[PDB]
Design a protein around this nucleic acid. Structure first.
Lengths: 600, 757, 138, 476
RNA sequence: UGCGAAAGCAGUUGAAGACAAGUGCUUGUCGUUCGUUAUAAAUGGCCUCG
């Protein structure tokens, strides 16, 4: 998963309503119909300026614009393509409230103006849905009235949810049938949830529930694939349809630190159990199922970025993992300027690969049984060792071995309680700081034998221990996860026969043939000749290593003069080895007349 | 929340007395001959012979008296002694209990207690209202006493009076009529036959008279008697010999007659009621019916196991009762009782309990006597040394794994036991075996092994698993070459894929791969793929060299195929490998030696921390849920969150798991549910003031991430294995072959009279 | 039953020259025409024919040799020299091939089986030479 | 009791064509140009050879009718779908229609053109209309009722038109391929005489066939290409053939494991079957004495033995065929209870199998080494005896006379990879068991020396095998 | 027998009692004990129901 750099679509006009950045997203509406995975067009209603349709690719461009008076606010906007009585057409339905005195529902038909109509709506329009199949426009009002009109804005049906001050209404389709659910605040942080089915009445109420403890004033809401997501006080509350029961609560620690009032937060869905969260100029791609931060990006060139809408992928059915989202970005400066920007989002594969090790949520051995049978203080040690003077080997070993009750200079099965990595790494630092040059404590020998030797200190360990051959020999035998690159360099650099044998065995045991070969191609052409010349001067492992050496250098680079020695050398062992095999197996492996001399 | 409860049964109960021979069987057939009664180690089963189903089951736990009492049943007598569907059970200690079958078990049976002074009850028998009991008192030879038993209605007590005594009884047997006793003593040896309820028969004679001079010249096996049989009339006595020769002796004049067909030691000899017929059985897995009139023989070959006992059961010899041993399983003695028909020699009732194969022998199980000392048998001398060595191994040694592999079938929830070269399919809902199928080649039922042939090792089924769908079986087998050959050290590794349509009961071999992963490389681990990947028709196989191989079933080829490979040719060997797959199937955790590795499935290599180092070698890797991974190393266990890459909890296993279990057994001991949590098992050794054979186990229910213990329960015996049934409950197998579960008017009188008529 | 046997090494799904005849036989999958070409046992002909054989057709020849050797192991040796020269002459071309194991899996498996005989034959000959050395001196 | 286990001892698609085992090679007096099958039972096929057409009975596989009225060479023997009528062309250009099985009577004679008429095919959908192609390069469409004027005269071919095809389910389309390398499509109810569109093959077209309603396969030059009319382009192309492909035929819904098959002649003596379901990939082939000019297969509804027919320029005809107490019978239909318990006897065991079941170890080894015994079966009995643990036992009671047969096979079996390990197993035992008998017997010693020469040779081969394994690691 | 990989790396196979045979002595055995991790061979081969 990844987040792309935002690219500008258009620059928002300098209108007083749009000057309030915190409410700016409220004054920009995104049409649901034109904005999805496959559409290259976006219809956007900018309150007080216009409703404009843009093409995104190959370059952002303005395709259409319908002006609106500066005193009017776009409360709901939708656009959809279809067939109308049959000609292909585009139907745009938008609501404009002017000073709360009047609300205007407007429908425009364009040929792909064919027609335009305007009526007075009883209350502020919250959402608009366009049904091109039945040539219907469905408008939900703040007073709870759902009115179904034709394209001529003739009222065909009216339904009352019996509740006013409706705050949220979202449309969704399941199994080919259209559904809408609505939220209406009640007193004492109580909320009415209703689910309505669109088919004497084309609207059928399926569910009506009151959910308690549901506050709005500091809550950001979005819905996706039957799940309603509520972000509040840094916690994401997830509700399941068709009865809107709280399934799980996700605590997001990166928001609890935000001071209440100054930080701008936007929250939209992008895929199955994946959502987009922006905190001022930082954008987060989140995975709610696994509770992992898939990706993070900071827009250093803008003060804030507010998500408006996001094209959501149904990754369960879609092989596509790339989508887009639209938001408002505000620039830094004395005269801030707001612009509409599009971000390309790679959601990923929706697998546990994408979430591993990316959690946004931030030991000691304990007995198995709390309480007639067989038995087949890290900081205190740290401070005692740190309190020692420099280059005091005897005291350093004495404190370590005595305090930890270690009996052997090498790690043993009994030394497990010391296995805590935090304690060890500190002891490594103390050994390095306290002791430099040619004398190290015996404690290092014990830690070297430890299986959990820190990976951070593996690098250069051979170089540090080069001066003492005994420690260098120990590092080869048992020091865990030593980087292969260093051993290959030491293999061709060391002239001691015993170390050469020990290194090769360690490489073959702990690294694959493929892993060895690639790094081993990097080795200089002269160094390999020195090693090969060493060979010409347990061994099968070395010969296998030589077989690898012949592999990496390649037939071109081999110089015929030197090979003359090698075949004569290699043939010298084949005859020997065949001889030895023959020896190996062997150790595993009457007359009618006779003359005889009788003894009497 | 959770609770433990025994579910299945156990082994059939046998009269496990060394001296007693020809009377091991304790199961009795009803007087009406419509059902067969068999006592098990923990229950009593009444099987209707006609329908061949368990019509009634009596569990000791259900009744308080049997719960406290159960000591083993030494005999069953039809009806009640004190006084039409009653039976009297006699146990070794002396409890005489009258219970009922074909009905409801009464919670107050007529419990009684015979008085015995340092005497262990061995046998009882009756002819007509007269009851005699045989008892044991203690040169490694037990002595026997014959007492008379009568019930006095005044005191309601079983009085015992002395009748006879014999010392250093070696072998003993009772006639079919239950009225004659033949036995052997060291007073080399002498045979004596005595009438029980009368003084009519009283004869004794040294064994050497019967033994031939050639038998004296040859080895002890020729002079070693293995079985005794006595005719009802007492005229004929049959002697078996380890060499395989049968000698019928006429008691009137001590004249001998030699019948020689058995190549190995004869185990079971039994006379017919008339005496003209002799049933013989031994290691050959074949029954021989000897016509004494013409010295002819009829054969019933290819039995499931070697014959321990033979007997004719019927007023006219209608049924034969047989005991089979299944000697291939050296770890455990698997007894199966078979009721055949003289008419057509067909099985009217085969009964046997679950047949697990433990890694090592348990308790005091000893291999049966044979002509030679072999892997599956003991020679004459080898018996005492083997018994002492077994005891001292269970006492002093530390390796006490006794861990058996078991499998659960998702579609049917049947239990699969990978028996040696075969699978036993057993239903624990019904507590009855459903099938026994050979999955391999080899000498398994072609012929009966005898003498050096017995040293041959049949193929070993080491791993047996099901796919998530359950329509496929994956099996891994090892072929052992015959000894004393150049190719005596090249073990062959074989993998097999089988399919079975749900209606049928027999699995069909679909594919065979010879020498997977290469030659002489074992498949240490196998893991079926999750439902996400290839809709549950793929699998992974992992070696001791770290090589991983992913097979899949491809429709176009119509069989399994090798899809992905990763062959890192590591130079070191370790049998401690574990493998786990995510539910989504995206990632694979492979733990080799001390090092755990995370692999991307798509590229089948390292993800791009992928290496986690462990203090010791990893035995088990399992993910309780998609978030958490529980990894057990030889010293401890640790819960790791992949999301954080940090350890949440760590539990110290070394005090209990140090060298008691071989690597890889922790896999089959540790179990995990995919919804609620996992479970940890620890068996431990009990003692009061040096080690004792008895064992005690504890089961701990753990939540995901191991934060808390949902429950801590204890069982009084070594729980060999646990698996997680696909239901919430877990099923556990106990070395007594016990499967339990841990989990959350004139007209009315007229009608009565007519019904009686 | 009808279950098929398989081996774990089956990495399948994971003048005087006759060059023109060889090329046509390989292109047309004419086994009879390929057979007569393979019958030549003169090494100088094997090198020359493979010397002039186009590199693209040299690859598929390896598979053809692999299968023919697999069907008849007694022809392993005489066809060994053929594959010997193909690698010798077209070794550079084979290097510049995206994948070799999948296309030459049969040669891998066929070639591997012969090696596994070597350890046992040496054991057989060693026991065998001991006995032969016995009666020859006696 | 259980029954004794029995001793245990290509593509399904390929196995199907192997069943055409019987091969009858008939000699005709000139190159056989065209071969056709009658669409109905008995499905007797017609062959065009020299100046006559011969019909062959399917079962008898012999000529039953001969049409020799044609003065000049003959160029077609296609039947009408009903099979009652048989049409043929001549070098003179006259096209003649004969009632099948009635050579004497001419049903209809038309002179299509002065030039030769090489193709004459009845329209599969419509009985009345007959299509002819001539060296005049106009493929006239004639009718049985109208014998004096064509109904349509398709043109536009600038070279010889020798390939006419009718698209199944699409009477719309008449497909013609000329030696221009262009395949032309024509619509009949339209005005015609101008192709709907032309498909470029780039090589002279020898035969065009309609595999399916939308798939047209054109075999011309050294390759055959399959074109989809909807997409108007070649979906697949195969050029495995060496010589120029000449003829091609298609059969569908026949009892083989495949749903369909596609046979194509090569002119190289090769006829190969291709699988339309698998992108027209090679699945089987045959070889003949000379170039193949015509190939044919029995129709799907042959109703009996299937026939594969190959036509050669030599006049040789190759035919491969795949062949296809009054109460003793009461059966208790009316009875209440029916019981069946009769068990079939086991399949006959071989002599070696009987011995093993009877523990005749030595004799079983003897049965192994007998003349005319399959090599693989010999391994099984040897493997079983090793598996049973009876190797020394079978070799105990033996002398030199009965030991040689084992050694002889070991001399040959040592070479084989599969038997090499087994041979080493047995040869090891006989040596440790008959070292002294070897001392006193000369003949075996010679058997022993030659064993060294061969086993030594195998070491060289196995050694050489390990060497080449080195290359295959370096090359990768 | 221990460990380990399958290859292998280390370590064992003792003492007493009783019997038989041969000549107190010698040899062999043990349904006898204590302690250590610790060739075979009585002519004797697998049913019938196509």
């Amino acid at each position: 998963p990844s987040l792309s750099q935002p690219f500008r679509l258009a620059t928002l006009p300098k209108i007083a309503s749009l000057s309030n950045f915190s409410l700016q997203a409220d004054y920009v509406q995104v049409a649901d119909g034109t904005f999805n995975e496959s559409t290259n067009n976006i219809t956007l209603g900018i309150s007080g300026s216009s409703i404009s349709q843009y093409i995104i690719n190959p370059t952002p461009k303005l395709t259409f614009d319908y002006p609106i008076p500066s005193t009017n606010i776009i409360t709901a906007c939708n656009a959809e393509k279809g067939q109308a009585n049959k000609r292909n057409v585009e139907i745009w339905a938008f609501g404009l409230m002017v000073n709360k005195g009047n609300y205007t529902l407007n429908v425009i038909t364009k040929a792909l103006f064919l027609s335009q109509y305007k009526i007075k709506a009883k209350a502020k329009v919250m959402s608009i849905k366009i049904d091109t199949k039945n040539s219907l426009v469905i408008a939900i009002l703040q007073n709870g009235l759902i009115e179904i009109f034709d394209f001529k804005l003739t009222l065909l049906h009216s339904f009352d949810i019996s509740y006013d001050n409706l705050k949220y209404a979202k449309w969704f389709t399941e199994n080919g049938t259209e559904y809408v659910f609505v939220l209406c605040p009640l007193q004492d942080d109580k909320v009415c949830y209703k689910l309505l089915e669109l088919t004497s009445s084309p609207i059928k109420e399926l569910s009506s529930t009151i959910i308690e403890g549901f506050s709005f004033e500091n809550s950001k809401l979005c819905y996706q694939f039957g799940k309603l997501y509520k972000l509040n006080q840094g916690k994401i509350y997830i509700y399941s349809l068709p009865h809107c029961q709280l399934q799980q609560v996700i605590e997001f620690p990166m928001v609890d630190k935000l001071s209440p009032g100054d930080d701008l937060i936007s929250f939209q869905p992008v895929s199955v159990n994946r959502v987009l969260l922006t905190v001022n100029n930082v954008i987060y791609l989140l995975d709610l199922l696994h509770c992992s931060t898939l990706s993070q990006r900071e827009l250093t060139h803008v003060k804030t970025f507010q998500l408006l809408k996001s094209a959501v992928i149904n990754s369960e059915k879609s092989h596509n993992s790339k989508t887009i989202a639209i938001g408002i970005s505000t620039k830094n400066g004395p005269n801030p300027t707001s612009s509409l920007e599009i971000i390309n989002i790679d959601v990923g594969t929706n697998t546990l690969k994408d979430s591993l090790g990316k959690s946004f949520q931030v030991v000691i051995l304990k007995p198995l049984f709390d309480d007639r049978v067989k038995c087949n203080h890290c900081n205190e040690v740290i401070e005692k060792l740190s309190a020692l003077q420099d280059n005091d080997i005897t005291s350093f070993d004495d404190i370590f071995f005595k305090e930890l009750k270690i009996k052997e200079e090498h790690y043993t099965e009994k030394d497990r309680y010391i296995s805590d990595p935090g304690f060890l790494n500190k002891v490594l630092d103390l050994i390095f700081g306290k002791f430099s040059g040619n004398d190290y404590p015996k404690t290092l020998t014990f830690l070297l034998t430890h299986p959990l030797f820190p990976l951070s200190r593996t690098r250069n360990l051979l170089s540090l221990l080069r001066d003492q051959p005994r420690l260098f020999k120990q590092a080869i035998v048992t020091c865990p996860n030593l980087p292969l690159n260093e051993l290959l360099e030491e293999l061709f650099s060391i002239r001691n026969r015993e170390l050469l044998l020990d290194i090769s065995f360690r490489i073959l045991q702990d690294f694959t043939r493929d892993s060895i070969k690639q790094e081993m191609k990097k080795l200089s052409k002269l160094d390999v000749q020195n090693f090969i010349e060493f060979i010409t001067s347990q061994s099968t492992q070395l010969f296998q290593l030589l077989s690898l050496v012949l592999d990496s250098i390649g037939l071109f680079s081999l110089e015929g003069a030197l090979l003359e020695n090698l075949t004569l050398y290699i043939d010298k062992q084949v005859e020997i080895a065949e001889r030895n095999t023959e020896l190996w197996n062997l150790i595993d492996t009457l007359p009618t007349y006779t003359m005889e001399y009788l003894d009497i | 929340q959770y609770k433990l409860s025994v579910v299945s049964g156990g082994k059939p109960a046998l009269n496990n007395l060394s001296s007693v021979t020809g009377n091991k069987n304790i199961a009795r057939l009803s007087q009406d001959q419509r059902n067969y009664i068999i006592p098990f180690n923990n229950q009593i089963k009444v099987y209707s012979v006609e329908t061949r189903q368990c019509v009634k089951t009596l569990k000791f736990a259900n009744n308080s008296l049997l719960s406290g009492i159960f000591e083993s049943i030494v005999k069953i007598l039809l009806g009640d002694i004190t006084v039409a569907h009653l039976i009297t059970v006699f146990t070794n200690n002396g409890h005489v209990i009258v219970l009922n079958y074909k009905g409801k078990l009464v919670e107050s049976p007529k419990h009684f207690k015979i008085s015995l002074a340092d005497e262990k009850l061995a046998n009882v028998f009756h002819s007509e209202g007269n009851y005699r009991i045989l008892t044991t008192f203690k040169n490694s030879l037990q002595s026997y006493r014959l007492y008379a038993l009568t019930f006095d209605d005044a005191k309601k007590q079983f009085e015992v009076a002395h009748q006879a005594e014999w010392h250093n009884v070696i072998l003993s047997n009772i006639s079919s009529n239950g009225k004659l006793l033949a036995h052997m003593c060291k007073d080399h040896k002498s045979i004596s036959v005595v009438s029980l309820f009368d003084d009519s028969v009283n004869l004794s004679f040294p064994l050497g008279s019967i033994l031939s001079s050639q038998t004296q010249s040859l080895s002890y096996n020729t002079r070693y008697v293995s079985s005794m049989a006595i005719d009802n009339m007492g005229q004929q006595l049959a002697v078996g010999f380890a060499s395989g020769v049968i000698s019928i002796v006429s008691l009137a004049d001590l004249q001998i007659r030699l019948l020689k067909w058995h190549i190995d030691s004869v185990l079971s000899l039994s006379f017919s009621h008339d005496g003209s017929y002799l049933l013989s059985g031994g290691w050959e897995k074949v029954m021989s019916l000897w016509q004494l009139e013409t010295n002819s023989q009829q054969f019933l070959p290819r039995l499931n196991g070697i014959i321990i006992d033979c007997q004719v059961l019927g007023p006219q010899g209608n049924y034969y009762s047989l005991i089979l041993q299944m000697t291939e399983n050296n770890s455990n003695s698997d007894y199966q009782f078979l009721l055949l028909n003289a008419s057509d020699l067909t099985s009217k009732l085969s009964i046997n309990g679950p047949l697990p194969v433990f890694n090592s022998t348990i308790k005091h199980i000893q291999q049966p006597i044979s002509a030679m000392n072999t892997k599956n048998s003991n020679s004459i001398t080898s018996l005492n040394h083997s018994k002492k060595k077994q005891s001292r191994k269970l006492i002093k040694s530390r390796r006490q794994d006794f861990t058996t592999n078991v499998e659960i079938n998702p579609i049917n929830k049947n239990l699969y036991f990978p028996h040696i070269s075969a699978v036993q399919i057993f239903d624990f809902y019904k507590n009855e075996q459903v099938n026994y199928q050979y999955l391999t080649s080899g000498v398994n039922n072609s012929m009966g092994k005898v003498r050096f042939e017995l040293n041959l090792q049949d193929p070993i089924i080491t791993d047996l698993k099901f796919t998530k769908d359950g329509q496929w079986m994956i099996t891994y087998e090892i072929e052992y070459p015959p000894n004393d050959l150049l190719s005596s050290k090249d073990l062959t590794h074989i993998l097999k894929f089988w399919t079975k349509n749900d209606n049928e009961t027999n699995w069909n071999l679909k594919t065979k791969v010879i020498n997977p992963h290469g030659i002489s490389v074992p498949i240490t681990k196998i893991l079926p793929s999750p439902r996400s990947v290839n809709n549950s028709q793929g699998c992974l196989t992992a070696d001791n060299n770290g090589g991983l191989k992913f097979w899949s079933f491809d429709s176009h080829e119509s069989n399994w195929c090798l899809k992905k490979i990763s062959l890192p040719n590591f130079n070191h060997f370790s049998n401690s490998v574990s493998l786990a797959w995510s539910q989504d199937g995206s990632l694979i955790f492979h733990g080799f030696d001390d090092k755990l590795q995370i692999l991307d499935f798509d590229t089948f290599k390292k993800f791009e921390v992928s290496e986690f180092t462990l203090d010791s070698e990893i035995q088990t890797v399992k993910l309780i849920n998609d978030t958490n991974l529980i990894v057990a190393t030889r010293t401890t266990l640790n819960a790791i969150n992949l999301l954080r890459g940090q350890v949440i909890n760590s539990f110290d296993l070394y005090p209990f798991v140090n060298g008691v279990y071989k690597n890889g057994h922790m896999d089959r001991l540790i179990t995990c549910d995919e919804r609620t949590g996992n479970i940890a098992l620890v068996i431990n050794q009990q003692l009061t003031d040096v080690p004792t054979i008895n064992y005690k186990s504890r089961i701990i229910i753990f939540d995901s991430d191991l934060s808390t213990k949902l429950g801590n329960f204890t069982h009084h015996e070594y729980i060999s294995w646990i698996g997680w049934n696909y239901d919430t409950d877990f099923i556990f197998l106990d070395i007594e072959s016990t499967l339990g579960v841990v989990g959350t008017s004139n007209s009315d009188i007229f009608a009565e009279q007519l019904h009686k008529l | 039953g009808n279950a098929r046997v398989t081996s774990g090494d089956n990495f399948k799904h994971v003048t005087g020259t006759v060059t023109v005849i060889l090329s046509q036989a390989l292109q047309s999958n004419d086994h009879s025409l390929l057979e007569t070409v393979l019958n030549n046992r003169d090494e100088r002909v094997i090198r020359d024919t493979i010397f002039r054989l186009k590199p693209a057709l040299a690859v598929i020849l390896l598979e053809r040799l692999a299968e023919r050797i697999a069907r008849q192991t007694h022809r392993q040796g005489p066809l060994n020299v053929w594959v010997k020269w193909c690698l010798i002459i077209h070794g550079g071309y084979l290097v510049s091939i995206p994948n070799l194991m999948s296309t030459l899996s049969s040669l891998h498996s066929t070639l591997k089986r012969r090696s596994d005989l070597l350890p046992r034959l040496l054991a057989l000959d060693a026991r065998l030479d001991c006995t032969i050395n016995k009666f020859k001196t006696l | 009791s259980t029954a004794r286990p029995r001793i245990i001892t290509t593509t399904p698609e390929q196995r199907y064509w192997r069943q055409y085992t019987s091969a009858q090679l008939v000699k005709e007096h000139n190159s056989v140009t065209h071969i056709s099958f009658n669409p109905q039972h008995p499905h007797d096929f017609a062959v065009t050879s020299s100046t006559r057409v011969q019909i062959f009975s399917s079962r008898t596989r012999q000529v039953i009718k001969t049409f020799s009225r044609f003065k000049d060479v003959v160029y077609s023997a296609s039947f009408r779908s009903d099979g009652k009528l048989l049409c043929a062309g001549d070098a003179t250009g006259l096209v003649s229609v004969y009632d099948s099985y009635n050579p004497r009577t001419i049903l209809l004679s038309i002179n299509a053109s002065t030039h030769p008429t090489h193709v004459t095919k009845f329209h599969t959908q419509d009985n009345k209309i007959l299509a002819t192609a001539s060296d005049d390069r106009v493929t006239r469409l004639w009718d049985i009722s109208n014998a004096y004027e064509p109904q349509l005269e398709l043109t536009g071919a600038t070279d010889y038109v020798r390939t006419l095809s009718f698209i199944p389910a699409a009477p719309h389309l008449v497909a013609t391929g000329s030696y221009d390398g262009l395949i032309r499509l024509y619509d009949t109810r339209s005005s015609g005489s101008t192709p709907i569109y032309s498909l470029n093959h780039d090589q002279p077209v020898e035969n065009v066939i309609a595999v399916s309603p939308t798939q047209i396969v054109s075999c011309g030059g050294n390759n055959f290409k399959v074109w989809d009319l909807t997409s108007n382009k070649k979906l697949y192309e195969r050029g495995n053939f060496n010589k120029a492909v000449t003829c091609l035929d298609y059969v569908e819904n026949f009892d083989s494991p495949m749903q369909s098959a596609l046979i194509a002649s090569s002119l190289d003596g090769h006829v190969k079957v291709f699988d339309p379901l698998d992108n027209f990939q090679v699945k089987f082939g045959w070889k003949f004495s000379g170039p193949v000019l015509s190939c044919a297969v029995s129709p799907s509804t042959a109703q009996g033995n299937r026939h594969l027919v190959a036509g050669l320029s030599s006049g040789l005809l190759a035919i491969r065929t795949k062949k296809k107490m009054r109460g003793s019978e009461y059966q208790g239909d009316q009875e209440h209870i029916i019981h069946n318990d009769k068990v079939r006897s086991q399949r006959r065991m071989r002599a070696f199998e009987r011995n093993i079941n009877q523990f005749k170890w030595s004799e079983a080894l003897d049965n192994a080494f007998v003349p005319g015994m399959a090599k693989e079966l010999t391994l099984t009995v040897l493997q079983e005896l090793r598996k049973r643990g009876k190797v020394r036992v079978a070799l105990y009671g033996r002398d030199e006379s009965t030991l040689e047969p084992l050694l002889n096979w070991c001399l040959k079996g040592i070479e084989d990879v599969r038997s090499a390990s087994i041979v080493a197993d047995w040869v090891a035992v006989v040596l440790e068991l008959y070292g002294n008998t070897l001392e006193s017997s000369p003949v075996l010693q010679e058997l022993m020396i030659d064993l060294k020469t061969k086993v030594r040779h195998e070491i060289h081969k196995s050694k050489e095998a390990q060497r080449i394994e080195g290359m295959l690691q370096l090359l990768t």
